Amino acid sequence: GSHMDASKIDQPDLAEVANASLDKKQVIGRISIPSVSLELPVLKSSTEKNLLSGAATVKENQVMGKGNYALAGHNMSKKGVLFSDIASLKKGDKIYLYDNENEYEYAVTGVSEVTPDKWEVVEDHGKDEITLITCVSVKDNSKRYVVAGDLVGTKAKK
Amino acid sequence: LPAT
């Protein structure tokens, strides 16, 4: 309302994405979605550079496999860009999270329209959930949708 | 509610 969040920053070109000093040693997990053939490493740091990898932790106190986990990805609305095919997710769509020790199975429940200042979606609700932040477009700054998914099971990597 |  009175104060607008600075989370509306434009994600630099794809050149910085493939030329950026990738911090692999900083990766704490990975995300995979066969339905939309999307795969990206999870970056612990919620910096602008980290957001170029397509996935970065929103809250520092997030615990994979427990509570409401959330990641933000930069989408320019151009096929081939990060989080662009995320909006193609359908209800009940399976999503897998890979922690350095295990893998958690999540099921997409749907999508909704929320503002970029809505930190509530990322707040812990005493339940195991996942929240992905995807921007509608680089031209649409009115509102952005957020995809939500619930935990359906857990399976360790043997 | 960070970037994106």
Short mmCIF file of C-alpha atoms in Angstrom, two decimals:
data_model
loop_
_atom_site.label_atom_id
_atom_site.label_comp_id
_atom_site.label_asym_id
_atom_site.label_seq_id
_atom_site.Cartn_x
_atom_site.Cartn_y
_atom_site.Cartn_z
CA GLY A 1 0.00 0.00 0.00
CA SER A 2 1.91 3.01 1.32
CA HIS A 3 5.26 1.23 0.99
CA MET A 4 6.09 -0.98 -1.98
CA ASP A 5 8.41 -3.96 -1.57
CA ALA A 6 11.75 -3.93 -3.40
CA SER A 7 11.20 -7.54 -4.46
CA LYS A 8 10.20 -6.29 -7.92
CA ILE A 9 13.79 -6.12 -9.20
CA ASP A 10 14.36 -7.01 -12.84
CA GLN A 11 16.45 -10.14 -13.31
CA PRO A 12 19.59 -9.36 -15.43
CA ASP A 13 20.01 -10.94 -18.87
CA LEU A 14 20.77 -14.62 -19.37
CA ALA A 15 24.41 -13.74 -20.01
CA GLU A 16 25.02 -13.05 -16.35
CA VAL A 17 23.18 -16.27 -15.58
CA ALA A 18 25.55 -18.55 -17.49
CA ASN A 19 28.57 -16.31 -16.87
CA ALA A 20 27.92 -15.77 -13.15
CA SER A 21 30.38 -17.37 -10.75
CA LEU A 22 28.09 -20.24 -9.72
CA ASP A 23 28.44 -21.08 -6.03
CA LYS A 24 27.97 -24.85 -6.15
CA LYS A 25 29.49 -25.30 -2.72
CA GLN A 26 26.64 -23.15 -1.42
CA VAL A 27 23.95 -25.47 -2.79
CA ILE A 28 22.08 -27.24 0.00
CA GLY A 29 19.48 -29.06 -2.13
CA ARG A 30 17.85 -29.53 -5.55
CA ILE A 31 14.34 -29.36 -7.01
CA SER A 32 12.90 -31.51 -9.80
CA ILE A 33 9.64 -31.43 -11.75
CA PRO A 34 9.44 -34.06 -14.57
CA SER A 35 5.95 -32.83 -15.45
CA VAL A 36 7.44 -29.60 -16.81
CA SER A 37 10.96 -31.00 -17.22
CA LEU A 38 12.35 -28.40 -14.82
CA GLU A 39 15.44 -28.89 -12.64
CA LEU A 40 17.46 -26.35 -10.64
CA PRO A 41 19.81 -26.31 -7.58
CA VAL A 42 18.57 -24.70 -4.35
CA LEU A 43 20.66 -21.74 -3.23
CA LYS A 44 20.69 -20.92 0.48
CA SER A 45 21.50 -17.25 -0.10
CA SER A 46 18.52 -15.06 -1.06
CA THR A 47 20.75 -12.62 -2.93
CA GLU A 48 20.17 -11.22 -6.42
CA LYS A 49 22.99 -13.37 -7.79
CA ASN A 50 21.56 -16.52 -6.17
CA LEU A 51 18.13 -15.81 -7.64
CA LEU A 52 19.69 -16.20 -11.10
CA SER A 53 19.97 -19.95 -10.51
CA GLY A 54 16.16 -20.09 -10.58
CA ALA A 55 15.79 -21.09 -6.94
CA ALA A 56 16.77 -19.37 -3.71
CA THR A 57 15.60 -19.78 -0.12
CA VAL A 58 13.19 -17.09 1.00
CA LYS A 59 13.51 -17.50 4.75
CA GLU A 60 16.69 -18.39 6.61
CA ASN A 61 14.84 -20.48 9.20
CA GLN A 62 13.35 -22.77 6.53
CA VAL A 63 13.70 -26.52 7.05
CA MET A 64 13.38 -28.84 4.05
CA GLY A 65 10.93 -31.64 4.85
CA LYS A 66 9.30 -29.71 7.71
CA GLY A 67 7.11 -26.59 7.89
CA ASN A 68 6.31 -24.25 4.99
CA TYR A 69 9.30 -24.23 2.67
CA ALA A 70 9.57 -21.48 0.05
CA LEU A 71 11.80 -20.56 -2.88
CA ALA A 72 11.86 -17.59 -5.26
CA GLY A 73 12.77 -17.86 -8.95
CA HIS A 74 13.21 -15.22 -11.66
CA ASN A 75 10.84 -15.46 -14.62
CA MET A 76 11.07 -13.16 -17.64
CA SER A 77 8.05 -14.87 -19.24
CA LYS A 78 10.31 -16.13 -22.03
CA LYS A 79 10.37 -19.86 -22.74
CA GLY A 80 13.73 -21.18 -21.57
CA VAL A 81 13.88 -18.84 -18.60
CA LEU A 82 13.60 -19.83 -14.94
CA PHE A 83 10.18 -20.42 -13.38
CA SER A 84 8.48 -19.79 -16.76
CA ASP A 85 7.07 -23.33 -17.02
CA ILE A 86 6.23 -23.39 -13.33
CA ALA A 87 2.90 -21.71 -14.09
CA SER A 88 2.15 -24.78 -16.23
CA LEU A 89 1.91 -26.85 -13.05
CA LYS A 90 -1.42 -28.65 -12.56
CA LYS A 91 -3.29 -29.66 -9.40
CA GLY A 92 -1.93 -32.86 -7.87
CA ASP A 93 1.28 -32.49 -9.89
CA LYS A 94 4.17 -34.34 -8.27
CA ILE A 95 7.26 -32.38 -7.25
CA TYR A 96 10.44 -33.78 -5.69
CA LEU A 97 12.87 -32.07 -3.34
CA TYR A 98 16.35 -33.48 -2.82
CA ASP A 99 18.19 -32.63 0.37
CA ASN A 100 21.82 -33.59 0.78
CA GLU A 101 20.57 -36.53 2.85
CA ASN A 102 17.08 -37.32 1.53
CA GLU A 103 14.24 -36.68 -0.89
CA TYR A 104 10.74 -35.38 -0.10
CA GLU A 105 7.65 -35.93 -2.26
CA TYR A 106 5.36 -32.90 -2.73
CA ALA A 107 2.06 -32.62 -4.62
CA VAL A 108 0.94 -29.37 -6.26
CA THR A 109 -2.49 -28.30 -5.06
CA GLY A 110 -2.99 -25.33 -7.38
CA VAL A 111 -2.15 -21.66 -7.90
CA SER A 112 -3.47 -18.35 -6.54
CA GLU A 113 -3.19 -14.59 -7.07
CA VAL A 114 -1.23 -12.75 -4.38
CA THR A 115 0.90 -9.61 -4.06
CA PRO A 116 4.76 -9.58 -3.88
CA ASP A 117 4.48 -8.07 -0.40
CA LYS A 118 2.56 -11.10 0.89
CA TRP A 119 5.16 -12.62 3.24
CA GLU A 120 2.31 -14.50 4.92
CA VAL A 121 2.36 -17.23 2.24
CA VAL A 122 5.95 -17.96 3.31
CA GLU A 123 5.12 -17.92 7.05
CA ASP A 124 5.01 -21.26 8.93
CA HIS A 125 1.47 -22.65 9.23
CA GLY A 126 2.30 -25.63 11.47
CA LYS A 127 2.19 -27.91 8.42
CA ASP A 128 4.48 -29.30 5.72
CA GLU A 129 4.05 -27.16 2.59
CA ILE A 130 6.00 -25.66 -0.30
CA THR A 131 5.60 -22.21 -1.86
CA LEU A 132 7.13 -21.07 -5.15
CA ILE A 133 7.17 -17.43 -6.19
CA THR A 134 6.78 -16.80 -9.92
CA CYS A 135 6.19 -13.45 -11.60
CA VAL A 136 3.43 -13.27 -14.22
CA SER A 137 5.50 -11.19 -16.63
CA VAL A 138 8.11 -8.44 -16.90
CA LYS A 139 5.34 -6.18 -18.22
CA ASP A 140 2.75 -7.07 -15.57
CA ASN A 141 3.61 -5.41 -12.26
CA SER A 142 0.02 -5.35 -10.99
CA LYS A 143 -0.13 -8.78 -9.33
CA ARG A 144 1.80 -12.05 -9.24
CA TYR A 145 0.61 -15.62 -8.65
CA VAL A 146 2.11 -18.06 -6.17
CA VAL A 147 2.12 -21.83 -6.57
CA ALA A 148 1.45 -23.94 -3.49
CA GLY A 149 2.09 -27.63 -2.85
CA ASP A 150 1.58 -29.95 0.12
CA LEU A 151 3.80 -32.77 1.40
CA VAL A 152 2.41 -36.20 0.50
CA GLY A 153 5.29 -38.46 1.57
CA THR A 154 9.03 -38.84 2.22
CA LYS A 155 11.61 -41.24 0.79
CA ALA A 156 15.34 -41.39 1.62
CA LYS A 157 17.88 -41.71 -1.21
CA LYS A 158 19.31 -45.25 -1.08
CA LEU B 1 8.46 -12.08 0.21
CA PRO B 2 11.79 -11.50 -1.62
CA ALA B 3 12.48 -10.89 -5.33
CA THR B 4 10.52 -12.55 -8.15
#
